[PDB]
Amino acid sequence: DFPAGTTPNEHNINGADYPRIGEDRRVHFRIHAPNAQKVEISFRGEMTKEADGYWSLVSKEPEVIGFHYYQVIIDGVSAADPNGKPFFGMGKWVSGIEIPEKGVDYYSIKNVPHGLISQSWYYSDIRKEWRRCIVYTPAEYDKNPTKKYPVLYLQHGMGENETSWANQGKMNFIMDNLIAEGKAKPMIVVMDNGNIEVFGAEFPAILVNEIIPHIESNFRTLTDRDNRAMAGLSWGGLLTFNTTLNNLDKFAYIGGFSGAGSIDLKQLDTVYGGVFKNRKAFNDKVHVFFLGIGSEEHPERTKNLSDGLQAAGINTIYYESPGTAHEFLTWRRCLKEFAPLLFKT
């Protein structure tokens, strides 16, 4: 039937045999479009017209491991693949290719206790609208009815929304596996909408004045700064820097995944209103200051920032994801590196 060495893409709907992934990491696309003049796949050019009204396309070169957004393009009109499950990225609902990694399973479903992923609604006076956040509770949450948990606030990038970390980021299985293996503390994770679907400038006030009170009123949480963390990817990492460094009374852990605020080391003593000027005071308040980056997305700026902070006396953790770029596998790996560091003082 199918080309040798291929399996259906993980994110196909049930019953969809294409697209398929080869063991050489080439992707095989196939679509029935007898009346179309031209069909393309995003970032891959034109498909080849086949007999019986079909079009086909196989990657010219092996694709990079990990998760990639795509759309089908019919005579210039881009749309989600009808054979695909939906992912919110690039500002709309699109499709996703998954190229598997050999010998890796930390974001896979395993026979371990699984936490819930929950939608929770709250009203924002700042934006005068109802809003939904996505909340991970650990598998043990309901079995420990008197226990309170620390909270990580986890933010997406440009063109994404509050669903992206739990869907293409696979964060619930990453947390499930880390907690089951004893590597991370049981924790609540809250994912909200930066409103940057396409500058998010309202989000810090929404998070501090609306989201945090909502979560603490409706989930069993520890509410002191030593039990509150924040991390974000891409533009969400800049939101995290701006939110945390201006609210150190509420956050003791900071993570930027391919993101980060602009810190000019020449201005280290004055940026963010002088928060870094007394080095040990800052280090005593922020237990984890994490900078992650992909090796293939020009890590030099991030590494120079980390090395320069360290040389000047501000502690950091630098993590470089080998072989990935500005893509979700980078951020899956960042979470896997960052979450085990939290809430262990």
Tell me the domain boundaries of the chain: 1-101, 102-345
DSSP for 186-219 reads --EEEE---S-----TTHHHHIIIIIHHHHHHHS
Task: Tell me if 70 sits within 8 A of 80, measured CB to CB.
Answer: no
Task: Tell me if 235 sits within 8 A of 259, measured CB to CB.
Answer: yes
**Joined tokens for residue 228:** 């509150």
Report the side by side order of strands in the sheet with 87-89: 66-70, 92-99, 87-89
Instruction: Tell me the HSE value of 330 on the side-chain side, using a 13 A CA sphere.
Output: 29
Instruction: Tell me the HSE value of 160 on the side-chain side, using a 13 A CA sphere.
Output: 23
CA–CA dist 201, 203 (Å, integer): 6
Contacts of 286 (CB under 8 A, 6+ apart): 244, 248, 251, 252, 253, 254, 315
Question: What's the CA angle centered on 209, arms 205 and 211, to 5 degrees?
Answer: 95
Cα dist from 117 to 46, 112, 171, 186, 303, whole Å: 39, 15, 10, 14, 34
Question: What's the CA angle centered on 251, arms 248 and 253, to 5 degrees?
Answer: 115
Quoted resolution (Å): 1.7
Query: What is the torsion angle, in degrees rounded to the nearest 10, for the CA atoms of residue 165, residue 111, residue 229 and residue 225?
Result: 150
Task: Tell me if 97 sits within 8 A of 27, measured CB to CB.
Answer: yes
